[PDB]
Amino acid sequence: MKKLQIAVGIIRNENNEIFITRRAADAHMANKLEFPGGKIEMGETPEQAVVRELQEEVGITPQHFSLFEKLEYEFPDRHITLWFWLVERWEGEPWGKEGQPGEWMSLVGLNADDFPPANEPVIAKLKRL
Ligand SMILES: Nc1nc2c([nH]c(=O)n2[C@H]2C[C@H](O)[C@@H](COP(=O)(O)O)O2)c(=O)[nH]1
Ligand SMILES: [Mg+2]
């Protein structure tokens, strides 16, 4: 009955663009282009879980918050929770420590192909823009 939670937030840049985390560059499933905010589970609260890990996945001081969308799905004995928060701004550059360096990209062209298919229902909403 293991349940793993995940909280993410698309950081908004100075040009209506957000920085997402990609699987570096191939050699590790390049089609898993996801976003920061992993390990929020631990033992935090639905609200403090992201807010705390946020510093861990951004480290900087960004005007980040809001909830764009949230998806809750369960895998064969593995409950995977994915929370999508709506970020509005970020000072300097996002660093934190997620494990996959990112760059300021435009979400206007987000793709369900580049990202992990495990979170399509969520992207299906924003993808349509
Ligand atoms: N299918 C799959 N899921 C993974 C891998 N690594 C990994 O972290 N995950 C999962 C578990 C987490 O709940 C979520 C976010 O990353 P973390 O495990 O690093 O926090 O995605 C992996 O190699 N394969
Ligand atoms: Mg983390």
Distance (Å, rounded) from C-alpha 95 to C-alpha 82?
21
Helix H or strand E segment including 115: none
Distance 69 CA to ligand 1 centre (A): 20
Residues with a CB atom less than 6 Å from ligand 1? 4, 6, 38-39, 80
Distance (Å, rounded) from C-alpha 31 to C-alpha 102?
14
Determined by NMR
Fold for 1-129, please state it.
Nucleoside Triphosphate Pyrophosphohydrolase (3.90.79)
Nearest CA-CA partner of 97 in 59, 60, 64: 59
Q: Could you state, in order of their start, the residue ranges of all structural domains in the chain? A: 1-129
Helix H or strand E segment including 56: helix 48-57
